[PDB]
Amino acid sequence: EKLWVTVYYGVPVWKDAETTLFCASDAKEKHNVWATHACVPTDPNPQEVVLENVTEHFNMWKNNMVEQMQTDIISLWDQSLKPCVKLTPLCVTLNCKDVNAERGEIKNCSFNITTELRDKVQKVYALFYKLDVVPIDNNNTSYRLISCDTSVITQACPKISFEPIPIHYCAPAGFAILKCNDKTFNGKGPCKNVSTVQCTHGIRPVVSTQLLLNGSLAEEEVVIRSDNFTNNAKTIIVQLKESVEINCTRPNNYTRKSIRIGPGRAFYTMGEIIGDIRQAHCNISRAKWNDTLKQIVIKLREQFENKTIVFNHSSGGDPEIVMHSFNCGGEFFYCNSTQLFNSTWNNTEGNTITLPCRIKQIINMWQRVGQAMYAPPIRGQIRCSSNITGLLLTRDENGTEIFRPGGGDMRDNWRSELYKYKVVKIEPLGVAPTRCKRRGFLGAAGSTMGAASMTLTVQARNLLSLGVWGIKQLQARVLAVERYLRDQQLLGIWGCSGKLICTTAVPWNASWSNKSLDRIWNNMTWMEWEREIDNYTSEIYTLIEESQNQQEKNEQELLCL
Amino acid sequence: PQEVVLENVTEHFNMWKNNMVEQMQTDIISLWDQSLKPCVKLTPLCVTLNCKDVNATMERGEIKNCSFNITTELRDKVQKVYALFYKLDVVPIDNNNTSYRLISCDTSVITQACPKISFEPIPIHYCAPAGFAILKCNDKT
Amino acid sequence: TIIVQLKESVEINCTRPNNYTRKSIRIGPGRAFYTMGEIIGDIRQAHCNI
């Protein structure tokens, strides 16, 4: 009957929020493009409290972590190429002839380099791939670099490695990462088995298109994830149970000559052909791909009803868009992934699929324009050993569904992995009625009001407290300190100098909640209660501040006389 | 806005020791440099400028038909181009011949203002951090 | 320096009459020098009227 407001600090409550997370690298230097120095060392053992009774709603397609990863990887890519040589004096008209052998793919190009010595003009010979070389005239021998006229071409430093390294994202103080531990999760929906993690699992930022290379696999069955499943033109991420294997080789052996540009800067180019001119023939085991296509078309028939499903190749066009593109060995491959999607299923030649591939050195990454990167050639054969881990399918009318290898920007290459994780902002302050007057972190979040009110200590303890990454981290830490001082000042103005639980003695009106203490301190989670009194939060807070502290302060001011 | 007339207080103001003026100077310089930083540098343009005059409250001698040799997108090839310049932006060289240069490019990294950046003044309010305040003098004279 | 603040403002109207065209000369890969083009009309002078 005689109920009073009591303020509880450290409540296991949260709401959806978007922030910047700290990148952490495995403890395990190589100057790898995604800099190790930027990212903190990983904790030796992660903690994964298995939140019980918590059924949170996840949605891969509205997830700020994916966009944050896109921005972070773009920033790290640009910063890694910042101090490397810029190929400004190489737009010169190139006299090119076909290499005497593929046919016409490699061009023997002569050009006059005018070095910074400025008393010589050196005629030099170099080999360029056909994809990077475009005509400039009706003369069949005069060409230029493909994108050097509308962009500044940055040469990648040969000392930068492109080998994938697992990168974790760890929550800052004041936020939490909730992981969905289900096995057949469909990306968008409620999750029945939720845990809280400080950092995510190892994520290899593999860059590829039409197909996801390396990474985690499904545990129960092949999982097909799409936001709507009927609008079309929405990537149908496919995660597999068993991994096919993309063995890929570039047979040709090449020698890398260097040409001075300025004092301490060099353009690394292709010297001459050693051995015969072969082609890059990626080998995929046909039987295994058969099985994978079966285990995918079954699920697609389940989702799209028993229609005939046809896997077609992508629509024709320029090689960069249409063809699959590895990041293996430091050489950018573009493979004609047509034999893999050439089947009608409804309801015999060879045993290995050989995909031809073309190597390209001048590239435009992240779908940007006006910027371009030159990858210097690698001496010797390149022998990949990748693992088929996922597919990206897109849809296009006689009762047949046409699926094609499609995809999108690199965000869709990480929705396939960060589909079991969500970032949540925690608001530790809450209020509840009591009779008085003046496990791990969120482990009791799904528990009732009673017996969750005994664990605020851990949540209160663990909730709070150079360069571009530096400034972002400084802004994040300052914001966290701000939040913490917001909470502490709210507690101070409420007369709770240092009391996780502080009784107010403000009367508990019956227009907020009419439920009795038994039905308020049991039968409900802190989430349902915080939602319930959401509208009255401002009013209640006002009453805790105005009605008491002021009056209590005046009273104590009047007690010493 | 939150303005509170302070009664019974008389305060000594001195604008010539007002640190806000220097702070605004730093602010404006930094804004100018920030706005001009992601724009075109005209260093490749500073060349021997062989410039004639333009034949027309009429003007006389102010606008000059000024030509120079520039590199095209192929680097090796050169192209002859022309533009009109005012007398003030050009400096004579080689005594009294028609060769000119661009003023101050002998010692400064001439930056071009991006055309999409507007120089229109917009009112700027200065606000102090919490724990500080700004006292306004309301005496008419 | 002596700073004078006035009771009432004085309108000043300034005109640049000479009609202009902008020509863009490429400096490099995606860098433009925006500059003078042809002059349209007669060559008068820019004046301020107070």
């Epitope: 324009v369 | 724009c39 075109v40 | 065209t21 020509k23 995606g30 433009a32």
Partner: antibody, heavy 121, light 106 residues
């Protein structure tokens, strides 16, 4: 205040050469791609080709089997030549200015369009 | 080439309502999208460039945003002068394909 005006015949029979001329008023030709585009009835706009500056590099929509040639005739006029015109080529043809520079409005977009001329077959 | 589609093919609206037009790319184009306005008897006008930047002199009411293959143009407070055919164009690969076009009716 750059304006573009197309001119040329409004009726060309099949298989001869279709000739159009875009004249630039207001300003002289400058280092922006000058592009010919068309809109057939009931179809989206299709790029035909472009030329850079006053004589220079060109590029043409690959899916036309090299039937198109573009060149500059006068410092304020450029022209489109389209060979082997067929009945499918009836369209409203526009000439447009495509910007290369990110320091001005309309970066990588047809900032300036002409009125457009309807050519049938 | 890269196929572009948009939705709806046509819609009706009155003065003062908000209109949303979705442009979908068959392949990712980054932020390199432009929005054009076409009226009878007049050449196309540029409304938005680089998918979120309004062109000079365009009314503030026109708002456009997106990334990857997905973009949306929102016209708030529809004016009688804004009834026109709106189209989206890419900018990454040449030819820069346009789109079917959405006609805004009274």
């Amino acid at each position: 205040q750059v304006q573009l005006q197309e001119s040329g015949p409004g009726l060309v029979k099949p298989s001869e050469t279709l000739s159009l001329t875009c004249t630039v008023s207001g300003g002289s030709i400058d280092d922006y791609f000058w592009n010919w585009v068309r809109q057939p009835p009931g179809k989206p706009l299709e790029c035909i080709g472009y030329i850079f500056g006053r004589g220079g590099g060109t590029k043409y929509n690959p899916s036309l089997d090299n039937r198109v040639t573009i060149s500059t005739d006068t410092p304020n006029q450029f022209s489109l030549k389209l060979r082997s015109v067929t009945v499918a080529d009836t369209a409203i043809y526009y000439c447009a200015r495509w910007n290369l520079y990110d320091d001005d409005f309309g970066y990588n977009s047809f900032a300036v369009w002409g009125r457009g001329v309807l050519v049938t077959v | 080439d890269i196929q572009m589609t948009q939705s709806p093919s046509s819609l009706s609206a009155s003065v003062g309502d908000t209109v949303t037009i979705t442009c979908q790319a068959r392949h990712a184009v980054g932020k390199n999208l432009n929005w054009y306005q076409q009226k009878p008897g007049r050449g196309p006008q540029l409304l938005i460039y680089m998918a979120s930047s309004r062109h000079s002199g365009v009314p503030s009411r026109f708002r456009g945003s997106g990334s990857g293959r997905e973009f949306t143009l929102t016209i708030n407070n529809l004016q009688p002068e804004d009834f026109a055919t709106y189209s989206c164009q890419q900018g990454y690969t040449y030819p820069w394909t346009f789109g079917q076009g959405t006609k805004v009716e009274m």
